[PDB]
Every structure is written in C-alpha cells, then in structure tokens.
Amino acid sequence: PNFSGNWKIIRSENFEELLKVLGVNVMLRKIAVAAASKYAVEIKQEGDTFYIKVSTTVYTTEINFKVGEEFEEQTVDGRPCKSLVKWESENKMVCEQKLLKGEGPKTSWTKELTNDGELIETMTADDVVCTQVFVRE
Ligand SMILES: *C\C=C(C)/C=C/C=C(C)/C=C/C1=C(C)CCCC1(C)C
C-alpha cells in the first residue's frame, strides 16, 4: 500500500488516559489533548522507507525509518527510546519501543491504512491504547 499523504485528524480517543499512564499531570494532559485536535501527519513512503512529519500548532518533529531497521526516537511524553517497525499485515505496521535509559511503561505505536481511505494510528502504554483517525487533506 501507499501511506503517502497529508493526513488530518478527525477523531482521537483515550489520549488523556495514555498520558496519565505516562505520568503527565492533569493540567498538562488537558492542554495536550487540545493540541492533539490540531494533530497532522505528513507521510512520504518509498518502498519500506518512511519519512514522517508530525505536527501540532506550535511543535513539529520528523520520524524517518526503514522497516526492520532499528532507529532512535522518543515516546510521546519525550523519553528517548530505541524503536523497530515491522509489518503485521499488508496495510498495518507495528513499532516496539525500549527506553534508552531508566525504566517505565511498555510503549508502542501502530499505523494502519483502511480500505475506506482512513489512516488509523494507535499509541500504547501498558494496558492503555489511544486511537487516532485521520483522512487525507
Ligand atoms: C505515525 C508515527 C509516529 C512515530 C508518530 C508519532 C507521533 C507523535 C510523537 C506525536 C505526538 C503528538 C501528539 C499525539 C498530539 C499533538 C502533539 C504531538 C504532535 C507532539
């Protein structure tokens, strides 16, 4: 499949509960939820290589990886981690993360292209799954 596109968020669920697991205090959780309503994802896919730019109104970052090749990024709350992405099916990829220093909750993310043209992203911390849904601009 082709994940390439400028993706705009239409739905976001359980993001506050995810940040709670990660230790973010309540006021910052509420503002982070508000920031997620301007969450946009720009993807350029070339084969198994992905160039991803994620952004909100005041913050943007780039995540570049090749499936099956370890890279370094951060968890959603900003802890550095080592990451590895694998395919789970034709249209879905899964990323397992391991903290680079210290310990913490078990975190991961997934990306899936649906047959209706939506992009579904999930982020997981231990038992809590946050789900975000996007459509192409
Ligand atoms: C789609 C693949 C990856 C690795 C996406 C990572 C996304 C983030 C780290 C995004 C974090 C944000 C959220 C969820 C809400 C708005 C503010 C951020 C863009 C920092």
Cα 1 → chain centroid: 19
The DSSP 8-state label assigned to residue 76 in this structure reads T
Q: Which of the 8 DSSP states describes residue 84? A: E
Resolution of the experimental model in angstroms, please?
1.9
Look at the chain and report how many structural domains it folds into: 1
Ligand 1, residue 121: give the atom nearest the CA: 1
Q: Is 40 helix (H, G, I), strand (E, B) or coil?
A: strand
What's the CA gap between 50 and 30, in Å, rounded? 31
Q: Quick count: other Cβ atoms within 10 Å of Cβ 124?
A: 22
Instruction: Provide Rg for the chain, Cα atoms.
Output: 14
Structure tokens at 123: 């982020």
Rounded distance, CA 71 to CA 17, Å? 27
Domain of residue 27, residue span: 1-137
Q: From the alpha carbon of 35, which atom of ligand 1 is closest?
A: 16
Tell me how the structure was determined. Answer: X-ray
Q: What is the CATH number of the domain that holds 54?
A: 2.40.128.20
| CA separation for the pair 33, 19 (Å, rounded) | 9
How far does residue 54's CA lie from ligand 1's centre (Å)? 6
Structure token digits, residue 104:
């913490």
Q: How many residues does the chain have?
A: 137
Determine the distance separating the centroid of ligand 1 and the alpha carbon of 79, expressed in angstroms.
Answer: 13
Q: Which helix (H) or strand (E) holds 18?
A: helix 15-21
> Residue 76 C-alpha to ligand 1 middle, in angstroms?
6
User: Hey, what are 16's tokens?
Assistant: 């506050």
Distance 14 CA to ligand 1 centre (A): 14
Q: Three-state SS for 34?
A: helix
Distance 7 CA to ligand 1 centre (A): 12
Read off the DSSP letter of residue 108: E
Q: Specify the DSSP element, H or E, that contains 121.
A: strand 119-125
Residue 79 is classified by DSSP as -
Residue ranges around ligand 1 (CB below 6 Å)? 35-36, 39, 41, 52, 54-56, 59, 63, 76, 109, 111, 121
